[PDB]
RNA sequence: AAUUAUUCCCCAUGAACGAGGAAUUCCCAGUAAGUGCGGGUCAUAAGCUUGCGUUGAUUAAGUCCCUGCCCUUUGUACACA
RNA sequence: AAUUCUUGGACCGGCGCAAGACGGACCAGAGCGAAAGCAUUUGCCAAGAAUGUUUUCAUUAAUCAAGAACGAAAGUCGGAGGUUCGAAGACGAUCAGAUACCGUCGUAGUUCCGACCAUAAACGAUGCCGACCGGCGAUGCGGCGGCGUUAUUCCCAUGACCCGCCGGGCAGCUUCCGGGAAACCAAAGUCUUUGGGUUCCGGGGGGAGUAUGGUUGCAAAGCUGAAACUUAAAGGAAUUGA
C-alpha cells in the first residue's frame, strides 16, 4: 500500500482479467507480470441471489468495488484481458463483461490496451450434452 | 414428398461430411447443413464507446473487434429467428438478404 | 454541468412501447454545427427548442 | 488477521537495449524474512508488452514476452523469451476464398538460444481478377512452405539472438518470404505469426548486462 | 283495501362514511362531468330507462406494449374440421 | 434451485510437468475413392482417373446364377490404455405422477493392436453399358490458342491474372424437346408411332419379415421364408377449408 512512483503523470498499469461467463462475472486486477493478485471481486460476492450473479448489475457493483480497492494500493490505469468460457463451450463474453469494463473506467481508472484471451482449441475433446444436444 | 432439390444441405459429391456441434445446444449436425454466421462486434457496445474513448491513456487507439463464427442446427436457427419459413417459390432464392447499413 | 439549448430541426417518427416519444434530430443553438438525435416526450413541433440536462448522450436511430 | 499489502515493496522493470522505451512498469513482492527470498521469488516471471508500448507509438497487433532473468537492486533486468500476434489481428487476416499457408522451423542461434518460428501467408487476389476464389494448387503450397522454412532458418541460424530480435521488431523475415514467393503464387499477409523459446543457454551475467546497454 | 310501513307532509331519532385493497368500466369537443326538465310504466308513481336544454373542461392527432379481431406465408395423418 | 466442490485454501491469475483424445478458423452446393469413407508437417512404399499421342496388341468386349474382396455406427472375445464424453446405474429438481426432458456423479463403451458380426433413411429413397435430342453462365483437373497486366529486371522462359476453344468430372440456371397422376425430371425424354444389350426385383392392406426347416456366428443375431385367419379399402400428388 505504498507505490514509489511519483504521481506527476506516470501511469502505474495493472491488468484486469475480466472473465464473463453466462452464470458468473470475475473482475480481477493483477500486477504487470500476471503473477501477484492485487484485488479479485467476483460477481456473486456483491449480490446473494444465485440466479443473477452474472448480471450487468452485479458486474457493475464488483467493478466499482475493485476500482475503489485498486486506487487505494495506487494502481492508476489498467490493461483489459477479456475472455468467455472457451474450450468446448460458448466463446461470446457473458452479459456482465460490458457493465464491468464500462463501470471501472467510469470509476476514474484509465484504460490501456484491450484484447481477447478466450481459450479457443485448435481442436478439442467431445462436448457436454448428447449427440441430440440439450432438448428443453 | 421431396421439398428441396438439394436435401437441405451443400453435399453433392461426397457421401460423408464430418458432423459439427450447434453453439446454442450441443447437437451433432453435418458441417455443410449447419446454418453458419460470422459475427464481428466491438469489445465495447455503443454508449460505453465515449466513456472508454476519453477514459483511455492512448490518443487515437482503435480498440479491437471480437470475431465469432457461430454454427446452429436448423432447430436453433429457426427458434432464434436467424432463418424463417418462406413462400414455396421464394424458398429457391439463394441471394443473401441486403446488408447496406 | 451546464444546461444547453437546442432547436429541433426535424421530426423523424414516434417510438416507445405505446408510441409515447418523438424521434427528432436537435441542433445546438450555441454551436451552429452539432446535430444529435434525441427522444422527446409531450407534443413537439418542428421549429421549437429543448433544454438538455446533458449535451452528449444520443438516441438510437430506429 | 493481517494487512496482506503492508509487506509488499514495489520494483522497476528494465526492457533490453533493443527496444526504445526501457521502463516497462511496476512489480510487487513480499521482501525476504527467511528461506523464501525476494530475488528467488522475483526471478522467472514473464511479461507480455505490446510493441507500441515498447517503442514510442507503433504496431499494437504484435506482443513480446520478457522474463526477469535476474534482479540487481530495486530493478528487474528482463530478456527476450517469446513473441506472438494478437487474437483480433490473427482472426481479421484469416478470411474465405484464399489458401492459408502455415510453416514452422526449429532453429538455433550462435549463443545457445533454440527458437521455434511459426510463419503464416495468404494467397493474394489479383488487380484485374474476375475469378472469386484465387486458391493455390498443393505443389505450389508445398514449394511456398519449403521457401518459408529455408528463409526462416538461414535468417536466424547464422547470427546471435540480439540481431534476431532486431529483425523481429520490423518484419524483415516476413518481407523476405513475401518477395521469394512472388514467382510461385503472390502472397500479401506474410507475418512471423509466433516465436517459442524451447532451450536456453547457461545463464551468464556479462551477456545480459551488455544486452542491457 | 296500505298491516309486511303505497305515495306525500311535520316534529322527533342523528347511524357507517376522513375519498375507498386486489382489480376494473366509460370517454377525445358543445364531448366527459355537474345540473335540473318531459315521455314510458301510471288509479297511486322514479334512486330505472328514454329524450331535452343548461354550465362546460384536463389530456391526444399516436402505437401495436397489453386485450381482441382480420389478413398473408407456412405445416398438417384434421374435414361431425 | 438443489445434489457436488471449498479456510486439510475450491474458483480466478502465473510458471512449469504428464496423459490420452482431437486436427478449429482456411472449408466451398470444391476435390479424391468401388461404396463405407477421407483434412496439421515431412519422409518412404505401391496404386489411380482425366488429359496428350501419326506408340503397341487386334475383338481381347457389356451385363452376370455359382463363388469372392471391402463394408459407418452399435455389439462380442483377447492384450494394452484410460484425457474427454457417457447406455447402465446413484441421486437432485420439476410433475397430479417421471421410471423422461433439465442438473452433479458415473461402470460398460468411446482410443490403439488382433480375431469376429455383415447391417443403416448403407439415399440420388433413382442398377450397369451404348447411341440420339435445346440454350446460357460459371466451376475442378489436362491440353491448346491469343491483346494486355505483374515476378524472375536480362526477360528467352517458366509461375499469378485476363479472353476464348477442346475433352472427362461435381453441380447450377432457363424453355411448350418431350414425358408424367402430379410434385417435378435434359432425364424420370426418344412408349399404343409400344423391340439397342443384360442382372436384380414388385403384384390390395394386414397376419409378418412372424411360425417352421436349413444354413452362418462364441453370443447378439444375419441370409432364405410361408399358412390359417381378418379386411374394403390402405395409399400417392395436388386443391379448397379448419
Ligand atoms: Mg452415408
Ligand atoms: Zn441446436
UniProtKB/Swiss-Prot annotation, chain A:
Keywords: Cytoplasm, Isopeptide bond, Nucleus, Phosphoprotein, Ribonucleoprotein, Ribosomal protein, Ubl conjugation. The modification Phosphoserine is found at residues 1, 124. It comes from the Eukaryota. There is a cross-link at residues 46, 48, 91 (Glycyl lysine isopeptide (Lys-Gly) (interchain with G-Cter in SUMO2)). Residues 116-136 are annotated as: Disordered. Gene3D superfamilies: Ribosomal protein S11 (3.30.420.80). Its main location: cytoplasm. One of its GO terms (cellular component) is small ribosomal subunit. PANTHER family: 40S RIBOSOMAL PROTEIN S14/30S RIBOSOMAL PROTEIN S11. Belongs to the universal ribosomal protein uS11 family. This is Small ribosomal subunit protein uS11.
From Swiss-Prot, chain B:
It holds the Pfam family Ribosomal_S26e. PROSITE patterns: RIBOSOMAL_S26E. Zn(2+) binds at residues 22, 25, 73, 76. The keyword Nucleus does not apply. It comes from the Eukaryota. Keywords: Cytoplasm, Endoplasmic reticulum, Phosphoprotein, Ribonucleoprotein, Ribosomal protein, Zinc. The keyword Zinc applies. The modification Phosphoserine is found at residue 53. One of its GO terms (cellular component) is rough endoplasmic reticulum. Belongs to the eukaryotic ribosomal protein eS26 family. This is Small ribosomal subunit protein eS26. It comes from Oryctolagus cuniculus (Rabbit). The gene is RPS26.
UniProtKB/Swiss-Prot annotation, chain C:
InterPro entries: NA-bd_OB-fold, Ribosomal_eS28, Ribosomal_eS28_CS. PROSITE patterns: RIBOSOMAL_S28E. The gene is RPS28. Component of the small ribosomal subunit. The ribosome is a large ribonucleoprotein complex responsible for the synthesis of proteins in the cell. Part of the small subunit (SSU) processome, first precursor of the small eukaryotic ribosomal subunit. During the assembly of the SSU processome in the nucleolus, many ribosome biogenesis factors, an RNA chaperone and ribosomal proteins associate with the nascent pre-rRNA and work in concert to generate RNA folding, modifications, rearrangements and cleavage as well as targeted degradation of pre-ribosomal RNA by the RNA exosome. Keywords: Acetylation, Cytoplasm, Endoplasmic reticulum, Nucleus, Phosphoprotein, Ribonucleoprotein, Ribosomal protein. Component of the 40S small ribosomal subunit. Part of the small subunit (SSU) processome, composed of more than 70 proteins and the RNA chaperone small nucleolar RNA (snoRNA) U3. It comes from the Eukaryota. Belongs to the eukaryotic ribosomal protein eS28 family. Gene3D superfamilies: Nucleic acid-binding proteins (2.40.50.140). The modification Phosphoserine is found at residue 35. GO terms for biological process: cytoplasmic translation; maturation of SSU-rRNA; ribosomal small subunit assembly. This is Small ribosomal subunit protein eS28. It is found in: Cytoplasm, Cytosol; Cytoplasm; Rough endoplasmic reticulum; Nucleus, Nucleolus. One of its GO terms (cellular component) is synapse.
UniProtKB/Swiss-Prot annotation, chain D:
The modification ADP-ribosyltyrosine is found at residue 135. The modification N6-acetyllysine is found at residues 14, 36. One of its GO terms (cellular component) is nucleolus. It comes from the Eukaryota. It is found in: Cytoplasm; Nucleus; Nucleus, Nucleolus. There is a cross-link at residue 14 (Glycyl lysine isopeptide (Lys-Gly) (interchain with G-Cter in SUMO2)). One of its GO terms (biological process) is translation. ADP-ribosylated at Tyr-135 by PARP1 in presence of HPF1. Keywords: Acetylation, ADP-ribosylation, Cytoplasm, Differentiation, Isopeptide bond, Nucleus, Phosphoprotein, Ribonucleoprotein, Ribosomal protein, Ubl conjugation. Its main location: cytoplasm. GO terms for molecular function: structural constituent of ribosome. Belongs to the eukaryotic ribosomal protein eS1 family. Component of the small ribosomal subunit. The ribosome is a large ribonucleoprotein complex responsible for the synthesis of proteins in the cell. Part of the small subunit (SSU) processome, first precursor of the small eukaryotic ribosomal subunit. During the assembly of the SSU processome in the nucleolus, many ribosome biogenesis factors, an RNA chaperone and ribosomal proteins associate with the nascent pre-rRNA and work in concert to generate RNA folding, modifications, rearrangements and cleavage as well as targeted degradation of pre-ribosomal RNA by the RNA exosome. This is Small ribosomal subunit protein eS1. The chain holds residues 21 to 233 of 264 of the full protein.
